[PDB]
């Protein structure tokens, strides 16, 4: 019925050793390159991509929807240019959620002028739990997350009315 959009991992203080300013033409807005407002694309800094480790404790007393993604480059040159490694992994866990992702490098038909892909994943973090993000490359970090409050009688309709 409602939710609060809150910043889970503040952009300016959560990643001092990564570049958090990445944009794409495919997400342009008003003529300039941009990116998702709730996600942050982390790339290396000063030639390095230091191992990441971040966590959030759900002190909102609501289920929290956490969104993130994994970048899958078109080639090796791009994988190394951005993450400085050929063997990146992304690992996301909570008390009950556990998933490890591995980037896949492949030539793909272009969609919206891109050959690579970003897969999107999500989970609902229960009140009092902790979500932990560990990675050495290819992570599109959550920036904003939603504290949800459920109601009754609602649904989704498709309409031009």
């Amino acid at each position, epitope marked *: 019925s409602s939710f609060e959009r809150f910043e889970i991992f503040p952009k*300016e203080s959560s990643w001092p050793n990564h570049t958090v300013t990445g944009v794409s033409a495919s997400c342009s807005h008003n003529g300039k*390159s941009s990116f998702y407002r709730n996600l942050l694309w982390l790339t290396g800094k000063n030639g390095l991509y230091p191992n990441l480790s971040k966590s959030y404790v759900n002190n909102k007393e609501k289920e929290v929807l956490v969104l993130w993604g994994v970048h899958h480059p078109p080639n090796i040159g791009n994988q190394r240019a951005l993450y400085h490694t050929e063997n990146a992994y992304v690992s996301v866990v909570s008390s009950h959620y556990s998933r490890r992702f591995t980037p896949e490098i492949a030539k793909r038909p272009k969609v919206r002028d891109q*050959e690579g892909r970003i897969n999107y994943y999500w989970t609902l973090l229960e009140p009092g739990d902790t979500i932990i993000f560990e990675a050495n490359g290819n992570l599109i970090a959550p920036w904003y997350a939603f504290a949800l409050s459920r109601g009754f009688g609602s649904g989704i309709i498709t309409s031009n009315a």
Partner: antibody
Amino acid sequence: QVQLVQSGAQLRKPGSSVTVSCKASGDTFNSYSIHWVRQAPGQGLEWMGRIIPVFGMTHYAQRFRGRITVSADKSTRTAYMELTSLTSADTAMYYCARDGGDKFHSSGHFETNQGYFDHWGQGALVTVSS
Amino acid sequence: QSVLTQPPSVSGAPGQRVTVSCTGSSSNLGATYEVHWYQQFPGTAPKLLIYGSTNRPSGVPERFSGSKSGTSASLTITGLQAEDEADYYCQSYDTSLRGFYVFGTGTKVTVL
């Protein structure tokens, strides 16, 4: 090093336009951006705009939008900038510069919106007077 | 454009340590962009001195080192030499007005 090569000094009258070229020599015209920076005599540096020749995309400073056009033609490995409706206040050294913080790939477009001018042209002086 | 504030002049004796400041805002640096520095001598194009706030280009002396904190940045020149007299500029990226690159106002560094 990589050398950007600019046109020489030129004189233009108020109301006319000026075209300043920048050829890529030893560069391997490739997926990198070329930026235009202006410096009036006695002043500091001002960014005017940029082009990425492999995508054909440009971006301009708000002060020049409507007056500045940037284009490139890879067959001669050359970038061009044109500034229209010139006045005496536009007398300046016009420099081209190559970034090193971008390194674009010939697939899709991604930027970190960070960079630096790794290589500079010598500067083309443009004088505007009657 | 000329939005990163720099002192108009910095000075000291040869052999001394001096610094050139660069103050930005939220759109520049405060939006986590880095600071780049250029060294310009009269008659020529500026050349890159520092990039990424702290790194040097090959060929740049150890005398030059920079840093960034908060929304401010600086260039430190330690052990001023006569050849260091120059116009120094800071550069970053400003996210306002649809996005633009910015320069500071410039600093003249004088060896006494």
